[PDB]
Paper text:
Siroheme is the modified isobacteriochlorin tetrapyrrole used by siroheme-dependent sulfite and nitrite reductases (SiR/NiRs) in catalyzing the six-electron reduction of sulfite to sulfide or nitrite to ammonia. CysG is encoded by a gene fusion between a C-terminal SUMT (CysGA) and an N-terminal bifunctional dehydrogenase/ferrochelatase (CysGB). The N-terminal enzyme module, CysGB, is a three-domain bifunctional dehydrogenase/ATP-independent class III ferrochelatase12 that performs the final two steps of siroheme biosynthesis. The C-terminal enzyme module, CysGA, is homologous to a well-studied class of SAM-dependent uro’gen III methyltransferases (SUMTs) that catalyzes the methylations to generate precorrin-210,13.
P1331Cβ sits 3.3 Å below the plane formed by the sirohydrochlorin isobacteriochlorin core, forming a hydrophobic platform for the macrocycle. Both P133G and P133H variants retained the ability to complement the cysG-deficient E. coli when challenged for growth on minimal media, albeit with accumulation of fluorescence indicating altered activity. The P133G variant has 5-fold lower dehydrogenase activity and is about 10-fold lower in its chelatase activity, whereas the P133H variant is deficient for dehydrogenase activity and about 10-fold lower in its chelatase activity. In the P133G-closed active site that binds the tetrapyrrole, the first turn of the α helix from the dimerization domain is unwound, altering the hydrophobic platform on which the evolving substrate sits. The structure of the open active site, as well as the overall fold, is unchanged. Removing the proline platform makes the active site less rigid by unfolding helix 6, presumably impacting its ability to bind and orient the unrestricted precorrin-2 molecule. P133G behaves similarly to D262N: strongly affected by increasing cobalt concentrations.
Residue numbers in the entry:
A (entry chain A): 1 to 270, 277 to 457
B (entry chain B): 1 to 270, 277 to 358, 363 to 455
The structure:
């Protein structure tokens, strides 16, 4: 990230503003609302500063910039129209390892002053890095049209109850479950807004009275095929609240960037499923919200049922969040719909990597008016070409291979069935093989890109 | 306002973390990502720190907290389990006027770390006071769901173009209206993400050349099978930016309640397909962002392809957001995995204007999933038995899969016909050995 947002406690900390015009005024206002001990150093001051100075809210130092005025400061702001002065200020601040904002020069400073949405104690800060004030001036408006009006009063009440919640609930999990119920009680929000303390307290006492479930849970979450935007809403909720997210190589890096930062991430890509099961098992037996994050959909060649049968055996709760399976994601992002008109009346999702014993039912797979989708079939692509041809599928059946479907690295190669073995040599795992007439739709429906 | 949020440029700035456990590793990850020149000081280090240190990404100092390690720091983080140490760090940073965070005591020092939505250079930070973090999580999660993850590339490119937009749009209102189109333009965002420097320029000139009123494009969005939680993030993001949403009855009311309040809504449910197609281009050529919301996934028995063909020949930009098809939705919510071990080598999604292959449908080691097959269900039981499928083959009908009205009836194929009329549209018929797994995997209840 370009910047690290921090929320500074400025009470009783010296800050210096250099400059005395309307810009310094706006910054001085913010720093005063944060309770900073403020010194303003400028040649001239607009009348608001003398008003603030007369009320003892800051110190004016009339004159050119005084480097020494930084010696005890925690923040500095150069807010003059003189870029030469502003650089002297920045330089002085740098030597003293003081964070410094140059208002007219966001990239030149150290810190940047974001747009603020004040719903004290709830604070939301927005900045497009100062390079684009428009989006800050605009996303701030969007967020302001997002946060409920009385979110501050709910958050204020939450702060008043924090001590009591910490006393009555020993573990982080319990407190989290209380907070979850607390923040979605609409009646409580409204009783807070109405200053209806009878109602506040009734709802509150019942809240604390509720037994909390202490069981861990394992949620199987379909990551989707790679594009972070194809995680479902519920899947995002699950990984934004997980304590442990167990994931493999088929969960994209962009999906993993939506896993809350406080989650423990456990990589189980290359292991024996018997050890995965017990990793899920052990962490859920510890009471934690465990997410098994899997590429695609958990129940399509996912080994997902296998983990769950052991959790069920161990009395561990679990749910499943479906995901966009590789077939749907590749379909949408390659412009190859899995069904169309009468191109295809059925879709077959088939594994290539089959159990050591036995092979596929190739006569069955060679049936017309199907779209075939082979999962992990790359190494068997030649065998699939051979078999499909040999059980009667037309030699010129369009085939497409989608590598890293839905990601920026998506690559599509396509051709006819007789090219399948050769096409698969051009892509790598992870790749889907689509066989069927719908592949010819790519040329009218491809909206994504060409690698 | 009890905290001043500031966004720190930490690249090449000495920052100190004290602690070497899981908490410190999370702060250290964050500070590494922000570019901090990082020293970590701890009695011991979990192996992730020795990995980062071998890679020269930070400096480890093993042993008691050394106050002099702060001598040139900009930021300090007390990330130990030891209150005594954290206060030693906090006091030593306070005396040196180094902003300092005590992870487990947000009121104990000079800054707290907010929840971050990172879309660099666009960043949103939310905090309401630390330790628990639920309110911040709820806002963060909601914002994570509303801010496309590439939006930072859009924001970066905007700052480059800021000079060009002014010397074309004279009034700030015009500039403002331009910027609103700019930041929601899908093809710009996907071109930037895909590094397609061709499609960027094309999309930029189109944004500068086409009228400030035109934003005409159709997005095919898969609503998923019913549960509003099964909409994708992109789907949510698309229906929030829609000027007009075209939907039918297979899009749940819950999905429809996610729709931007000022959007026009066009119901095309019970309407032959040609009139729907016409509606979509008719709206897209009026310069409006059109979302066609379709139940499940748009490209699975949705006629999604046919809608886009009308548009592609008309020069109207479009995209497709895939959805949770009924099969996978119902599978997850009925505890019937479509595949499992050696039960089924393949899954077949099949509909209920031609013919249907029965001996093919009857073959072993498949999971059959019939869409729109409730009317043809008596035939289904007859034909599959008549083509060799064993009598005891488990069958299930899943009606209103993933909704709070979901009903699952299950038995064997020999009861399938009677099980069918016991259920109404919209419903899937699932046939296969995986159906028996519902006893141990049914969690939806
Ligand atoms: N992004 C992607 N692009 C193409 N194929 C993918 C893919 N992600 C997963 N796959 C396919 O899925 C196989 C793994 S099997 C697990 C698939 C997952 N459960 C799903 O529902 O999609 C890989 O061998 C590959 O064929
Ligand atoms: N919630 C649901 N539960 C069970 N079946 C559903 C369903 N929603 C849609 N269907 C099935 O889908 C059929 C319409 S065909 C449209 C399917 C959609 N494009 C998808 O991908 O799921 C219905 O007849 C019904 O059998």
């Amino acid at each position: 990230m370009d910047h690290l947002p921090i929320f500074c406690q400025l009470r009783d900390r010296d800050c210096l503003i250099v400059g005395g015009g309307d810009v310094a005024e706006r910054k001085a206002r913010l720093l005063l609302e944060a309770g900073a001990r403020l010194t303003v150093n400028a040649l001239t001051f607009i009348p608001q500063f003398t008003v603030w100075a007369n009320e003892g809210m800051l110190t004016l130092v009339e004159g050119p910039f005084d480097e020494t005025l930084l010696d005890s400061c925690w923040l500095a702001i150069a807010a003059t129209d003189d870029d030469t002065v502003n650089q002297r200020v920045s330089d002085a601040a740098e030597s003293r390892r003081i964070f410094c904002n140059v208002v007219d020069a966001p990239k030149a400073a150290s810190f940047i002053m974001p747009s603020i949405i004040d719903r004290s104690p709830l604070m939301v800060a927005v900045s497009a890095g100062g390079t684009s004030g428009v989006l800050a001036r605009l996303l701030r408006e969007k967020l302001e049209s997002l946060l409920p009006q009385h979110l501050g009063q709910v958050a204020r009440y939450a702060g008043q109850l924090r001590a009591r919640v910490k006393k009555q609930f020993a573990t982080m999990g319990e407190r989290r479950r209380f907070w979850e119920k607390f923040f979605v009680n609409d009646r409580l929000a409204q009783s807070l807004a109405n200053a209806d303390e009878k109602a506040v307290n009734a709802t509150t006492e019942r809240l604390f009275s509720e037994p909390l479930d202490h069981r861990g849970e394992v949620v199987l979450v379909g990551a989707g095929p790679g594009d972070a935007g194809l995680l479902t809403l519920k899947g995002l909720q699950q990984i934004q609240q997980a304590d442990i997210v167990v994931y493999d190589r088929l969960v994209s890096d962009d999906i993993m960037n939506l896993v809350r930062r406080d989650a423990d991430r456990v990589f189980v890509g290359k292991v024996p499923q018997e050890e995965i099961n017990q990793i899920l098992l052990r962490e859920a037996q510890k009471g934690k919200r465990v997410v098994r994050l899997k590429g695609g959909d958990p129940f399509i060649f996912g080994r997902g049922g296998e983990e769950l049968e052991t959790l069920c055996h161990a009395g561990i709760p679990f749910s499943v969040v479906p995901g966009i399976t590789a077939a749907s994601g590749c379909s949408a992002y390659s412009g190859i719909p899995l069904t169309h008109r009468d191109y295809a009346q059925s879709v077959r999702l088939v594994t290539g990597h089959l159990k050591t014993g036995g092979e596929l039912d190739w006569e069955n797979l060679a049936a017309e008016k199907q779209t075939l989708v082979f999962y992990m079939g790359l190494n068997q692509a030649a065998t699939i070409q051979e078999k499909l041809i040999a059980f009667g599928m037309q030699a010129d059946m369009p085939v497409a291979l989608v590598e890293n479907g839905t990601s920026v690295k998506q690559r599509v190669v396509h051709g006819v069935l007789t090219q399948l073995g050769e096409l698969a040599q051009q892509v790598e795992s992870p790749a889907l093989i689509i066989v069927g007439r719908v592949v010819a739709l790519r040329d009218k429906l491809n909206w994504f890109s060409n690698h």
